[PDB]
C-alpha cells in the first residue's frame, strides 16, 4: 500500500538521523572503550554480571537493519552502554570514568535529536 511505503520512508528518515546521533555519540569516546562487545574470551564471567550486553558495534547493526522504531529504543541500548559499564567497573577506573564523560557529553546530542524527531515527525 502507499500507507506502507509512506511509513517506510519515515523509518528510512528516523535511521538517518539516529545514524547521525550514533556518530556523535561515538565521538565522545575517543578512546573507543565502548566500540564492541565487552570478549568473552578475556572476560568469561562478564554475562553472570550482565544481563544485557551492548556496544556501538551491535547498535550500528542493529541500526542499519532500520531495527529502532523510535528514539526511546535507540536511547535504552546508549544508556545499556554506559549503566553496564558503570556497573561492572569500580569507581576509580578509566572505564566508569569514560561513561560518565560519554553520558555527560551525550546528554546534550539527545537533548536536541528529541527535539528533532518531534520537530520533523
Excluded at 575517543?30 to 556496544?55: C, G, N, T
Excluded at 558495534?57 to 553496564?84: C, P, S, V, W
Excluded at 569507581?91 to 518531534?118: I, M, W
Amino acid at each position: 500500500s502507499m500507507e506502507q511505503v509512506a511509513m517506510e520512508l519515515r523509518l528510512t528518515e528516523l535511521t538517518r538521523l539516529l545514524r547521525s546521533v550514533l556518530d556523535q555519540l561515538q565521538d565522545k569516546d575517543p578512546a573507543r572503550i565502548f566500540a564492541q562487545p565487552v570478549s568473552l574470551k578475556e572476560v568469561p564471567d562478564y554475562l553472570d554480571h550482565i544481563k544485557h550486553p551492548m556496544d556501538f558495534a551491535t547498535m550500528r547493526k542493529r541500526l542499519e537493519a532500520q531495527g529502532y522504531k523510535n528514539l526511546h529504543e535507540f536511547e535504552e541500548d546508549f544508556d545499556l552502554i554506559i549503566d553496564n559499564c558503570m556497573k561492572y567497573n569500580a569507581r576509580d577506573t578509566v572505564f566508569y570514568r569514560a561513561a560518565v564523560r560519554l553520558r555527560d557529553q551525550g546528554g546534550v546530542v539527545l537533548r536536541q535529536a528529541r527535539r528533532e524527531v518531534d520537530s520533523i515527525g
